[PDB]
């Protein structure tokens, strides 16, 4: 659904819980510290890459300025500064999309 | 160090039966013989056939009552008549039990040209002597 009612729909609450979306995702990478820049994108030529980020794997989710409670959990409620893409677990493409969306 | 018809001591998670536990040198001291015939006695004969066809009986009945028994058998051959005694569990149906009873008894009688009988003792869970 293009609107944001998929969030209020119960599949979201049973699939996530009280935690954020990024909390479920985890990165597979080299030893020790991970890379400092996430992948360029998760989808290419109508094809998804292995180990995609949550916003990209859940196609029903739609990033937009209006879904305030969907894009609020990334930025700290107590610190107005957004987290970085290696933190949130998402690729740089949708990360930048969400940055201009929140702005 | 001798290894003969004996169970190795494990951590303590191996239920064992009386004969399955006890050693083969107490067969007369703290056990009984599985079979009772006279071919072993002096003057008799055909003991080789007795033993061979007893082994065959044990194997055949073990494999025609598979998964139900929980111990070795008891042979009892009085003159002509043969008797076998077994212990089994009660997971399958008495229908199958009696059907196989009749089938096996008829096969044994027709094969050995001998009157034969067989008895079974039901158990919910196989009796264990010790935890080895």
């Amino acid at each position: 659904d293009e609107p944001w009612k998929y969030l209020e729909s119960e599949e979201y609450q049973e699939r996530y819980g009280s935690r954020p979306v990024w909390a479920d995702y985890r990165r597979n990478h080299k030893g020790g510290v991970p890379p400092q820049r996430t992948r360029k994108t998760c989808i290419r030529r109508n094809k998804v890459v292995g180990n995609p980020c949550p916003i990209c794997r859940d196609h029903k989710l739609h990033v937009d300025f209006r879904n305030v409670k969907l894009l609020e959990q990334f930025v700290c409620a107590h610190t107005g500064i957004i987290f970085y893409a290696p933190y949130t677990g998402v690729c740089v493409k949708q990360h930048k999309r969400l940055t201009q969306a929140i702005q | 160090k001798n290894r003969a018809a004996r169970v190795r001591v494990s951590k303590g998670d191996k239920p064992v039966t009386y004969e399955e536990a006890h050693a083969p040198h107490y067969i007369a001291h703290r056990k009984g013989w599985l079979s009772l015939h006279t071919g072993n006695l002096d003057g008799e004969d055909h003991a080789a056939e007795r033993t061979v066809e007893d082994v065959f009986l044990r194997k055949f009945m073990w494999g025609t009552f598979p998964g139900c028994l929980a111990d070795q058998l008891v042979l009892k051959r009085r003159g002509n008549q043969l008797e076998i005694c077994a212990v089994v569990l009660r997971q399958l149906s008495p229908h199958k039990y009696y059907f196989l009873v009749g089938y096996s008894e008829t096969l044994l009688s027709y094969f050995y040209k001998c009157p034969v009988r067989l008895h079974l003792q039901t158990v919910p869970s196989k009796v264990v002597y010790k935890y080895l």
Partner: protein, 343 residues
């Protein structure tokens, strides 16, 4: 011959070769293992390639209240039943051999970030599902013996916590991995270390200590700071229930001494309420978000002191050249501030 044939379990033993030189001494083999299989449980006792229909075992004995008769299974029916049995065996084999996905903790093939779930209930009966467990370290200790020689003894260290400031670590040694896990879990759930925290997510103030040639420094931080600490430290913080701090470890690196000194410091940290009770002064917190406003946090339970503390100028205080450098900004390192994983 049929007399030469025998039962199953002995053939299974002879094929698996559980006992031998191959396994003894711990040399083992090149990770080839034929798994146990049970053929007798699978197929029903009734049917063979000759498809006689048995009313006693293979078919229900009565039909329409009418006795049944011995009958023959046709060619196509026998073949279809055999195909169904082939499919069933394939299904069983697939379900037997599959992937096993234990959560990736600190890294693959490592017992660092894995939880075994809460401890088992006590004998008197005490279920502690609220407790969550983690495994700090797993190592293979080896001591020799005259009889056998090199015998391996798995040593493991574990920690458990509520997430409510109450936790505890322990150690467990045994020849078996699962048994050592269980023993260490019981020892931890018995031996508990509780610690207080300031606002449910931070320590009371910055701490610095050493323990067995192991220097550690805890640094209090405000909200939204995160847990940028050693992996063991962040695991124990998750278990305790504190959500953000900083910690630095230098000198030697040994996990058991690390945890021991950590619990020692976090237990010796003195509550500011008791500090005011001992001093006779009111606590006052000041933030960067909040302006010049005195935030009273605690007061002495006893009577307030009459006169205030005298100002302490140029006090004798031991501190860290590293923090001095970081405060002056002269410090440089590529490895200090990175975009590490989430918390």
């Amino acid at each position: 011959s049929f007399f030469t044939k025998l039962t199953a379990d002995e053939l299974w033993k002879g094929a698996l070769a559980e006992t031998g030189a191959g396994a003894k001494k711990g040399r083992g083999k090149r990770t080839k293992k034929k798994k146990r299989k049970d053929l007798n449980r699978g197929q029903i006792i009734g049917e063979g390639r000759y498809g006689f229909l048995w009313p006693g075992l293979n078919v229900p004995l009565m039909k329409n209240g009418a006795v049944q008769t011995i009958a023959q299974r046709s060619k196509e029916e026998q073949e279809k039943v055999e195909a169904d049995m082939i499919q069933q065996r394939e299904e069983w084999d697939r379900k037997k051999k599959m992937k096993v996905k234990r959560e990736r903790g600190w890294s693959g093939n490592s017992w660092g970030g894995i939880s075994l779930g809460p401890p088992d209930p006590g004998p008197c009966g005490e279920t502690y599902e609220d407790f969550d467990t983690r495994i700090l370290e797993v190592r293979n200790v080896f001591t020799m013996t005259a009889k056998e020689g090199r015998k391996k003894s798995i040593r493991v260290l574990v920690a458990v916590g509520n997430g409510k400031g109450a936790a505890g670590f322990s150690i467990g040694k045994a020849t078996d991995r699962m048994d050592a896990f269980r023993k260490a879990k019981n020892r931890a759930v018995h031996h508990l270390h509780y610690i207080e925290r300031y606002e449910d997510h931070t320590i009371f103030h910055d701490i610095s200590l050493r323990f067995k040639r192991t220097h550690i420094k805890m640094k209090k931080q405000p909200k939204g700071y995160g847990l940028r600490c050693h992996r063991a430290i962040i695991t124990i913080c998750r278990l305790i229930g504190i959500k953000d701090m900083y910690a630095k470890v230098s000198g030697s690196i040994n996990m058991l001494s690390l945890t021991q000194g950590l619990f020692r410091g976090l237990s010796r940290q003195e509550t500011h309420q008791q500090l005011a009770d001992k001093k006779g002064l009111h606590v006052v917190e000041i933030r960067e978000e909040c302006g010049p406003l005195p935030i009273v946090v605690a007061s002495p339970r006893g009577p307030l002191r009459k006169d205030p503390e005298p100002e302490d100028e140029v006090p004798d205080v031991k501190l860290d050249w590293e923090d001095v450098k970081t405060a002056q900004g002269m410090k440089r390192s590529v490895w200090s501030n990175l975009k590490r994983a989430a918390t």
